[PDB]
Design brief:
With 501 residues, the protein is of the alpha/beta class. It has three domains: 233 residues, Alpha-Beta Barrel (TIM Barrel); 98 residues, 3-Layer(aba) Sandwich (Rossmann fold); 162 residues, Rossmann fold. The protein is built from 19 helices and 20 strands. The strands form three sheets. The chain has an eight-stranded parallel sheet with strand order 7-6-5-4-3-2-1-8. A six-stranded mixed sheet has the order 10-9-11-13-14-12, with helices on both faces. It has a six-stranded parallel sheet with strand order 17-16-15-18-19-20, with helices on both faces. Strand 2, helix 2 and strand 3 form a beta-alpha-beta unit. The radius of gyration is 26 Å and the shape is elongated. 50% of the residues are buried. Bound molecules: 3-dehydroshikimate (DHK). The site of 3-dehydroshikimate (DHK) has 9 residues, from loops. It is found in: Plastid, Chloroplast. Monomer. Keywords: Amino-acid biosynthesis, Aromatic amino acid biosynthesis, Chloroplast, Lyase, Multifunctional enzyme, NADP, Oxidoreductase, Plastid, Transit peptide.
């Protein structure tokens, strides 16, 4: 619906002087406007302070004076709260946000008294879930019925599938609509506003100034997700997983997409149920997906067609939705990714029997013997007796035969479990090379103690980048820009302890 989405910065400093500085920071970061959350001011002298903000703000101002009954910090007299909003309007505010509950009354009190460049946003906040399209429409009509210039509906994501309903609302409602879904599971709704008609999205001045759950930073929206490039036709891709907030796939793919001018955007996809997810996002808009724990094997089953190597391995980490029939094709780039990294580093002990374990184990047999150690024995057992290998009780891993190579394919060691390692340091001696598929952190405890053991270490980054540029080729149909990916990872994927949520 209409213009690309604006980016609004929430201003919550508890002091007016601090808010003035934040509005300047908002402009520096690239925001289009700022939402002044008046309910967060410790001391507030309405007439004097509003004037100061409107006068000093380098960006258009949106004033909100959120009450405790609507999830804000304001308590006290309702008429006084409204007086402030009317005051903001008559002092030159670009917008004010008024709760649907009192919208009609408010709008009637300023009828014929609204300045020229002024818009009233009427908002509704749902903290429990995301209602049906039926209920959402009723909500939109009610808000429009108040006389609102702009409709704002904030819901909560119980499941990622919920977002699709909000996109349908912003995409089809014939009235300026700010539609967002709160929570990590609703993050995608804050990122794709420009593709689906959203009037604006909120981005934080920094990762610690959140006014609502799931809000990304302005810097990430603009530089990580390439917000300004997202349009009605951009194809959407994403990393399916749980957890998924540590994934750096959105970093590399968005950089690569931008570099080669491919019209696509890549986001994080926190998926609880793979089947419901795929069904909720089956349109052509969603062209491809990357899969990590714990949806690699399930992805194999969900794919209409499966590549020989994938079907052979028993796990899929790459899903491509073919334009033709529109079906799902499954591929596996983990095998070549990890195996290649290991050979480059140069009997294989594979920790973990999940999709990554299958892929690595499989690839390995295709070239010495391989033992599959896994806590859940049944899993390691099934795998072991598939690639013609031996299983092993995880507890017995600390003992073993020398010059062997160790390959962890489990999440052990991944942030925030930075002091966790799948094997005792004293047992690393029996290994020549140690590989860790975990790449966040780059240097896990396993790899660190492995190096202190004189063994050669192959970081997860080596495998991650490799499997990533192969996915780029699958998603785009363009030659894998290998050198580019290494450069992107090095320049944009080196910070640790990052969580996108
Ligand atoms: O984004 C990640 O963390 C990814 C991690 C690995 O499991 C790859 O197989 C995925 O394709 C991408």
């Amino acid at each position: 619906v209409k213009n690309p989405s604006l980016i609004c910065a929430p201003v919550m400093a508890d002091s007016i002087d601090k808010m003035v500085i934040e509005t300047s920071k908002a402009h520096e970061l690239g925001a289009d406007l700022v939402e002044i959350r008046l309910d967060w001011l410790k001391d507030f002298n309405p007439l004097e302070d509003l004037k100061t903000i409107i006068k000093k703000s380098p960006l258009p101002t949106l004033f909100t004076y959120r009450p405790k009954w609507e999830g804000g910090q304001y308590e006290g007299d309702e008429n006084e709260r409204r007086d402030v909003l009317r005051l903001a309007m008559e002092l030159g505010a670009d917008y004010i946000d008024v709760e649907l509950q009192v919208a009609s009354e408010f709008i009637k009190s300023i009828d014929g008294k609204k300045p020229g460049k002024f818009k009233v946003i009427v908002s509704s906040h749902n903290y429990q879930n995301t209602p049906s399209v039926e209920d959402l429409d009723g909500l939109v009509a009610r808000i429009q019925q108040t006389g609102a210039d702009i409709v704002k509906i904030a819901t909560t994501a119980v499941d990622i599938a919920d977002v699709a309903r909000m996109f349908h609302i912003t995409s089809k409602a014939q009235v300026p609509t700010i539609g967002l879904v709160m929570g990590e599971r609703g993050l995608m709704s804050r990122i794709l506003c420009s593709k689906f008609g959203g009037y604006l999205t909120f981005g934080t001045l920094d990762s610690s100034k959140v006014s609502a759950p799931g809000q990304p930073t302005i810097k990430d929206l603009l530089d990580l997700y390439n917000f300004r490039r997202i349009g009605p036709d951009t194809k959407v891709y994403g990393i399916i997983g749980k957890p998924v907030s540590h994934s750096k796939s959105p970093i590399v793919h968005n950089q690569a997409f931008k570099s080669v001018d491919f019209n696509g955007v890549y986001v994080h996809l926190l998926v609880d149920n793979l089947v419901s997810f795929l069904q909720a996002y089956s349109s052509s808009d969603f062209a491809g997906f990357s899969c990590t724990i714990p949806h690699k094997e399930a992805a194999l089953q969900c794919c209409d067609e499966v590549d020989p190597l994938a079907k052979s391995i028993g796990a899929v980490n790459t899903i491509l939705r073919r334009k033709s029939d529109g079906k799902l094709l499954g591929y596996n780039t983990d095998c070549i990714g990890s195996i290649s990294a290991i050979e480059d580093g140069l009997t294989v002990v594979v920790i973990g029997a999940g999709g990554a374990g299958k892929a690595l184990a499989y690839g390995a047999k295709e070239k010495a013997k391989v033992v599959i150690a896994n806590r859940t024995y049944e899993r390691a057992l099934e795998l072991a007796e598939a690639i013609g290998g031996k299983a092993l009780s995880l507890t017995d891993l600390d003992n073993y035969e020398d010059g062997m190579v160790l390959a962890n394919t489990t999440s052990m060691g991944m942030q925030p479990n930075v002091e966790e390692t799948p094997i005792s340091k004293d047992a690393l001696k029996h290994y020549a090379l140690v590989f860790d598929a975990v790449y966040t952190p780059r240097i896990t405890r396993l790899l660190r103690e492995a190096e202190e053991s004189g063994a050669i270490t192959v970081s997860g980054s080596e495998m991650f980048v490799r499997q990533a540029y192969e996915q780029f080729e699958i998603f785009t149909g363009l030659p894998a820009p290998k050198e580019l990916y290494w450069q992107i990872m090095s320049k944009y994927g080196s910070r640790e302890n990052l969580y996108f949520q």
